[PDB]
Amino acid sequence: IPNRRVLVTGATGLLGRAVHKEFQQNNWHAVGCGFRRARPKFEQVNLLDSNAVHHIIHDFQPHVIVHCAERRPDVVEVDASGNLAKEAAAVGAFLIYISSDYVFDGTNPPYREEDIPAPLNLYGKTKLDGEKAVLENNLGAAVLRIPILYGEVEKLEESAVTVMFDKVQFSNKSANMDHWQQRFPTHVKDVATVCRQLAEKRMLDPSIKGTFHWSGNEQMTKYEMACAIADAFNLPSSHLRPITDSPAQRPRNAQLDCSKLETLGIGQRTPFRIGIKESLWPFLIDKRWRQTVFH
Amino acid sequence: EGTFLFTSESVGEGHPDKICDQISDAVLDAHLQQDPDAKVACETVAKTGMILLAGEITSRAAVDYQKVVREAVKHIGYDDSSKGFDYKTCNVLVALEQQSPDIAQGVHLDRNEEDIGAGDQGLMFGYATDETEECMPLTIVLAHKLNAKLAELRRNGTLPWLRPDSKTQVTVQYMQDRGAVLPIRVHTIVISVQHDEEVCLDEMRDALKEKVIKAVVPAKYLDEDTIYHLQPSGRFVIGGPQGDAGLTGRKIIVDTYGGWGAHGGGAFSGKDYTKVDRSAAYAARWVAKSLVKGGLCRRVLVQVSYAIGVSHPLSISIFHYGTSQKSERELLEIVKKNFDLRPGVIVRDLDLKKPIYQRTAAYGHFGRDSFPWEVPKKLKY
Amino acid sequence: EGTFLFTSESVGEGHPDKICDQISDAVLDAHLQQDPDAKVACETVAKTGMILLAGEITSRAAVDYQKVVREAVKHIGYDDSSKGFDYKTCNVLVALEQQSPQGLMFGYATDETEECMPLTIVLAHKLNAKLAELRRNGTLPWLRPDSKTQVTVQYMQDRGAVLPIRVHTIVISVQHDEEVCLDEMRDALKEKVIKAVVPAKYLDEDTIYHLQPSGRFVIGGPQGDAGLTGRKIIVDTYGGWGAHGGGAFSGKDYTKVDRSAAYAARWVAKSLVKGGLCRRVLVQVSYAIGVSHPLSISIFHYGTSQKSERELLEIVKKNFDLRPGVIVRDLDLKKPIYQRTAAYGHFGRDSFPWEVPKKLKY
Amino acid sequence: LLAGEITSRAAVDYQKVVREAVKHIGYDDSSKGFDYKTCNVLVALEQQS
Ligand SMILES: Nc1ncnc2c1ncn2[C@@H]1O[C@H](CO)[C@@H](O)[C@H]1O
């Protein structure tokens, strides 16, 4: 019953399940797609299958598109990324290429919508390649950048924030926790809204593009997150070594700078207290012991 | 992965074990019209030529049993030797007595109505799942609506070669999800259904698939590999009570959750509000739906039990398959505040003296629009 | 906490719905004892003074149904008009249609009792069987055949398994004579019955007793209510625990998967738990059309196994043949036994084959 | 319905007897009130040898 249209790639994965649903609760005709776990909730479309991709962009007629396209760590060490921008630009669809802060060096906070990119790794680099590819194949596209994503997950490994929860629960095991590298948790439910409002605002201004930055205002490290997470469910916190060693590849900070994007009434920030508490209650041991097909 | 298969079945109005469930509920309805305080346990039998009633009834009402039986058999659609059976010419034996004095004195006599005791003892479950809009398992929802679609098309005439006996098994490939279950795709469908002589086998499958299946099942759950066994018997025209043996209450897993959650034994049909096999089973469903719709869990199973001549339940129990943030006691305590589950309060809350039971006789008692127990309570915690 | 309640019920031999179940398998016994390849779907309806037999049969046998019907009723103990029923007078109609020549099954087992059965129904059965025993001694000579029992256990959840902590509520109602006074009966049900049946550790002074809560139970048997075959399937199986696709067992022959595959599913699940691999398990075997072998098998071990489902499944594939034909062979399902199953439940009993664990090479 | 005592060696398909007779008489369709094919046959004979 709504009119103008959105397509969400990687809508099976964590970021995209929020992106798709966040459009589709404020009157949009929303249709996510994915390579794996698509049916029944989303359409089956491989991104590296170049025919199938245009086949659904053609048919549906999406006014706005939002590429997301994982199992987070990694957090140690493409290209149809942009081929999508080619096809998406043709049919007059504003592509929002979600990207990582890891494109940077990580030596001075912050980094601006403008600053020089200098990636230190495999990942960081090829997120840059995607921005070029996307942007030069169509200079009518936003490169909305995000930090580490937590969200309301189905399996822990879906987020580098959440994988830690097992470690946080079991006191009987002690494990260490990274404090050397600074970090920046952000709710996908919030990025879902920044993506939604940077689209409703593509009519109130008919030309927006040229990179965008968005993050959450809550600075932590793997360790500082862990202790918040204990303190949300009220658990023992002290089985957890910090470290300031480099167990040498990653940046040691990046941090984003959301000047431009805050300016137009485009933002949302759920507190990490709640954000994470609402995400990880199903993976309490006692709730896991209770989750079976039969009683 | 956490991928499991699961199958549930339904049957058509004109399957023997559901002819009885339905005749019984007709005799119930009959009595409740002239007398809402009728007590009725009417068990019914269907053999080749025969519908025999047996049971016990206390009811001021006088009822023409010959007419009620034959009118319902007609409604079901058996009217000729062409088909298995025929209300006009069938044997109807009655063996209904007055009810046992020893139950009367210690169940419903001389008592303020909210404190009438359980009709019998026993255990009843009631279950709910966020997997569908109707808070029922996809398997059993799809299964029922196939036999519903079949009968609808039989009656309105677009498929006149249809005949009332049918069976439908629906297997679905499910996935676990933080305690809840997620339907992915319909793995196998089966439909055998009694047919006319004229219509040939290959028009029937072509029909079942485009007229019936496609209408009922959202194309999201179907793909190429979805398997279809439409009329896999072939020679299914000789169908109904003929050759066979029906009984009331031999289809209790179809009558309820298609094999999900749990079931505590009790048959529903032919019984009134004082039989907690029925009343408290509608109530426990009311509970478990109200909890899920009220967002307290995605999935829950509830058990209650009663003792004969004792108004309060002996035990409420809440299993929420780990799908609520609230613990299982927290939900149980909410249920104490918001429900009085004695049989004398349930009758009010759900209007169980109105003669509406013949609707519930087929296609399931749970997960349907009008039914009182399907309207969730706004909960106050 | 992590403390919960759960209730289950059983009925005595004399209950009209169970009378029927015995007679249907009596009639089955009777046919196989001649033609061991008999095909049988024998319903039984019992109501004041009547036993009606219904439904298709195919056999080579000649069965004197009068003999069969009455010998069961005699056994169950209804022999004089005063009890409401008598095998000497009861009318025996017969409507069987003799001749002369798909879905899903569940098994369950639990570590909480010697018999791998949910404690709730174990005790419920034992009470009815204990009554019948005492009736048949003439220790309690004022007993009559029809009875009913319900047992609410207070469990604790523990690492996927369930720990029975106490008996919380017990209900017994049994048909009696018009002589014996009410106190004598409730004082007898407690000491000579319940205290004989239930481990003293599970009983204490808060355990709630409903002994003859009906007040008076003289009229009963096929008189007090109509009785029908296959109307107590949760009493016949796992008492509310586990799961149930919906197969009525009694009066069906071994060629009914509903019954045979059900028994094997139990056999398996019990073997698995008895074999030290699970504390608790549900086993879900789904037969499809055009497959000798079960198409799928799921094993829900409630996380009480040091092994995965795949690991557990593999053990099963290399220990068990669950092709319907093999199951009838492995479990000796042509003996005239079945009448013995139709009372006090099919699972948890040592005389039976499917209750004898296969020792597992893996 | 069949009723009353017999003493015999013969085993007899009462289904068959009762139906083939009801056919020979000519009750063949439920259009006529009765049909050898659809009618109930109850037996209540009390047979020994
Ligand atoms: N007075 C009674 N008290 C308790 N249970 C009874 C009574 N009469 C019959 N029953 C049992 O309950 C069922 C129907 O109420 C019967 O099958 C019988 O076993």
Author numbering:
A (entry chain F): 15 to 83, 85 to 92, 103 to 272, 276 to 323
B (entry chain B): 15 to 395
C (entry chain A): 15 to 115, 135 to 395
D (entry chain C): 66 to 114
What does the study report here?
The crystallographic structure of the MAT(α2)4(βV2)2 complex reveals that MATβV2 interacts with MATα2 through the insertion of the C-terminal tail of the β subunit into a cavity created at the interface of the MATα2 dimer. The complex has four active sites located at the interface of the MATα2 dimers. Briefly, the reaction is initiated by the sulfur atom of the methionine which carries a nucleophilic attack against the C5′ atom of ATP followed by the hydrolysis of the tripolyphosphate (PPPi). The structures show that two of the four active sites are occupied by SAMe or adenosine whereas the other two are empty, thus providing details of structural differences that accompany SAMe formation by comparison of empty and occupied sites. In all of the structures the adenine group makes a π–π stacking interaction with F250 of MATα2, supporting the hypothesis that the substrate (ATP) and product (SAMe) can occupy the active site in similar orientations. In addition, the N-terminal loop (residues 1–13) of both MATβV2 in the complex, which is orientated to the same side of the open active sites, is disordered. This observation raises the question of whether the N-terminus of MATβ could regulate the gating loop of MATα2. In our case, co-crystallization and soaking experiments with an excess of NADP yielded crystals of the MAT(α2)4(βV2)2 complex without NADP.
